[PDB]
Amino acid sequence: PLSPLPAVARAELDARTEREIDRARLRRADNGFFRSARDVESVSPADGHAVAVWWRQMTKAFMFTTLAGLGALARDYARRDADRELLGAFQTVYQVIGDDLDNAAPEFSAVAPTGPAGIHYVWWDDTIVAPLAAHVTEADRRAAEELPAPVRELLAAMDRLAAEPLGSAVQLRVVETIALDIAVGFRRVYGKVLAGGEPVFGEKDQFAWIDAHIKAEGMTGLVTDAERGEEFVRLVEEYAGLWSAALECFGDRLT
Amino acid sequence: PLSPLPAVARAELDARTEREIDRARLRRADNGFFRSARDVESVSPADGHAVAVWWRQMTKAFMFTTLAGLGALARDYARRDADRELLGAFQTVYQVIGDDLDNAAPEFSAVAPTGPAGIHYVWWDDTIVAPLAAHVTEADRRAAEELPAPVRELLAAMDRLAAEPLGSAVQLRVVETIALDIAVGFRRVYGKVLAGGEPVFGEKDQFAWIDAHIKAETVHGMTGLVTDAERGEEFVRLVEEYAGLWSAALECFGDRLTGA
Numbered sequence: 001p002l003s004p005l006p007a008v009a010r011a012e013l014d015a016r017t018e019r020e021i022d023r024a025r026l027r028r029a030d031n032g033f034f035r036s037a038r039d040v041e042s043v044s045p046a047d048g049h050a051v052a053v054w055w056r057q058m059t060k061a062f063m064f065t066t067l068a069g070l071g072a073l074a075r076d077y078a079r080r081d082a083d084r085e086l087l088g089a090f091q092t093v094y095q096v097i098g099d100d101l102d103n104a105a106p107e108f109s110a111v112a113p114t115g116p117a118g119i120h121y122v123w124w125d126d127t128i129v130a131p132l133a134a135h136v137t138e139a140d141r142r143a144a145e146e147l148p149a150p151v152r153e154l155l156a157a158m159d160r161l162a163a164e165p166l167g168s169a170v171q172l173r174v175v176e177t178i179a180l181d182i183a184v185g186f187r188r189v190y191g192k193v194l195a196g197g198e199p200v201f202g203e204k205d206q207f208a209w210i211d212a213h214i215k216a217e218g219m220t221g222l223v224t225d226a227e228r229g230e231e232f233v234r235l236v237e238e239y240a241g242l243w244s245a246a247l248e249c250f251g252d253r254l255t
Numbered sequence: 256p257l258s259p260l261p262a263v264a265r266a267e268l269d270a271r272t273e274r275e276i277d278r279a280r281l282r283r284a285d286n287g288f289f290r291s292a293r294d295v296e297s298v299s300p301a302d303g304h305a306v307a308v309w310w311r312q313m314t315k316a317f318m319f320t321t322l323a324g325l326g327a328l329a330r331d332y333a334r335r336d337a338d339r340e341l342l343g344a345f346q347t348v349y350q351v352i353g354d355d356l357d358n359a360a361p362e363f364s365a366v367a368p369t370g371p372a373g374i375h376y377v378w379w380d381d382t383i384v385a386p387l388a389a390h391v392t393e394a395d396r397r398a399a400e401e402l403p404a405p406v407r408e409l410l411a412a413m414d415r416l417a418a419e420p421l422g423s424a425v426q427l428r429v430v431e432t433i434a435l436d437i438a439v440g441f442r443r444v445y446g447k448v449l450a451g452g453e454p455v456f457g458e459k460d461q462f463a464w465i466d467a468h469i470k471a472e473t474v475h476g477m478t479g480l481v482t483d484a485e486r487g488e489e490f491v492r493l494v495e496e497y498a499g500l501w502s503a504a505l506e507c508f509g510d511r512l513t514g515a
């Protein structure tokens with residue numbers, strides 16, 4: 001009869017994880033991506049396009065490997081009797097993934113393309129990558145798809161967490177924290193990409209994907225014993241560090 | 256370059272799949288569960304309770320192992336380029352799971368409890384198993400939890416499909432075919448449970464779980480996830496196995512309703 005840790009023990013896990021995120025240099029003030037997105041004067045199409053391709057692959061992998069992690073947990077709950085407080089947290093994960101896979105929240109369903117075109121990595125590909133690709137060469141496009149080492153390392157960690165029953169809680173706990181600052185950074189960068197001196201993105205609804213996200217924006221509820229709690233913090237530490245290294249790679253390329 | 260098979264080959268897979276469901280004797284007129292549910296004059300609390308406990312465990316495993324199977328497919332899609340037609344079929348699996356996990360379809364959310372109390376195996380436990388359990392002895396309650404062999408075999412197949420990237424497609428293809436007849440069967444069975452001379456289910460709203468399932472299946476493809484001919488053969492083999500085990504588990508229900 002599986003149950004979550006007592007509340008006060010879960011509050012401690014929340015504080016420890018909020019500290020690891022601090023420690024990983026992911027806050028609006030500490031990560032170079034959020035800073036460069038604000039500081040830099042203009043962005044070349046090739047630089048903006050490369051970051052857009054990297055993000056497409058990162059968010060694709062985030063969605064699918066978080067769903068896989070939820071499935072790993074589902075496999076366990078098929079063979080145990082999770083109590084209703086655990087089941088509620090399990091439902092939350094399913095609901096949150098539904099933003100990226102099916103535009104669940106009204107902030108998304110009103111504006112997103114329907115069907116598969118609305119899946120968030122596809123919607124990003126169609127509305128950010130594609131208009132930038134017209135301003136770059138095929139050789140550039142192929143180069144952008146050879147992902148840099150910090151992005152590759154984060155994707156490798158997502159593949160490992162795809163098999164971990166704690167994996168979806170780890171990924172959503174970290175990503176939900178930094179999501180809004182990422183979205184605001186993108187709103188800024190792609191307003192500053194210029195081609196014939198002129199902005200590539202110059203209408204309102206070319207930012208639909210980004211603005212829907214800024215509008216739109218407990219996981220420890222799935223920890224069932226103190227040991228799994230320790231594993232949760234260990235995994236958050238690894239994953240938060242890899243996310244930070246990947247976002248600094250964004251900042252470096254934008255300069 | 257990951258794409259569904261051409262529409263001609265998928266239509267052929269669909270026909271082979273319908274034939275496997277026919278051969279498994281899962282149709283309305285074939286399976287002993289639907290027959291017994293229509294024919295029996297009355298159902299004892301102990302017999303109704305046992306079937307409801309077995310059902311609770313079967314539908315709990317169906318939900319979690321189908322979601323696990325979707326996760327196994329997600330593992331593969333994380334590193335491949337599935338085209339938009341595959342992605343659309345993937346979205347559909349996610350949406351359909353949401354009925355049981357989150358009462359996604361409006362027919363369900365209009366009556367279901369909110370939060371985890373609305374998960375379908377939990378809602379069944381609270382509204383069907385619990386009122387029946389008031390009318391059975393402790394010995395009988397413990398016996399009901401000793402699941403019979405055909406039920407255990409089906410749960411084991413569900414565990415095996417939890418790891419299979421085709422597993423969610425296999426389970427939904429079969430269950431969506433038989434869901435209406437199962438729900439109608441339960442409406443008939445639990446309408447005929449009497450304790451003393453009184454109906455155990457004497458108020459319309461006690462049937463809410465069953466009536467919602469009947470409406471959702473009434474008022475309203477998985478082969479689209481098959482990406483080559485070798486996977487198509489595996490899909491048909493898995494459907495044959497899984498449909499056979501579903502039919503045997505339902506035959507076990509029918510036997511319980513007609514026992515000496």
Ligand SMILES: CC[C@H](C)[C@H](N)C(=O)O
Nearest residue numbers: 059062100120121175179
């Ligand atoms: C990593 C996920 C981010 C924050 C966003 N939800 C997206 O669709 O890309």
Ligand SMILES: CC[C@H](C)[C@H](N)C(=O)O
Nearest residue numbers: 314317355375376430434
């Ligand atoms: C096996 C699933 C059946 C058809 C129903 N959806 C339920 O919640 O039990």
Ligand SMILES: [Fe+2]
Nearest residue numbers: 099100120213
């Ligand atoms: Fe998203």
Ligand SMILES: [Fe+2]
Nearest residue numbers: 354355375468
């Ligand atoms: Fe259901």
